[PDB]
Write a protein that binds this DNA or RNA. Sequence first.
RNA 1: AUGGCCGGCAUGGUCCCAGCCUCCUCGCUGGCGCCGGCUGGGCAACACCAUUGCACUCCGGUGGUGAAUGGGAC
Length: 95
Amino acid sequence: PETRPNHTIYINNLNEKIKKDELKKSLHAIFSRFGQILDILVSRSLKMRGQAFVIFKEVSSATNALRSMQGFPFYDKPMRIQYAKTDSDIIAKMK
RNA sequence: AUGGCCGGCAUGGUCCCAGCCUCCUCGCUGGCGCCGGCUGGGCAACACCAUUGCACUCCGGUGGUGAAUGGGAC
């Protein structure tokens, strides 16, 4: 259990009734102030719906975002944030 | 008539205006009498069910047409 600090924050318990394009945009709307964002990956498949991967360029940003937005009401539901289990390719491709 | 198709019945005709209808050419050269049955596509939108799930491969399922009216000129 518990994951180590990552460039990517995993968010779940997201309102599934929201279309993908929008959700990505809305997330960017509230997480950009924590640092540059490389990408946000949203999938509405059975397995990946209700979750999202916010990929920050600097771990500190992900750390800040994780500590502040935890519990935040988004689309009438409280976000549940953690660090992603493994680096995201966009990250591998660099560091 | 409809995503494509057949049958029973009913029913004077053509146009104009508005209102309403719908998953499958959204609107003025689409449709808006009654009844029965045959079959295809798709989750794209809408809805419902199920799902709290760690990805970098798009990808659970089911439902709707089993729909919607009047006025006016000839």
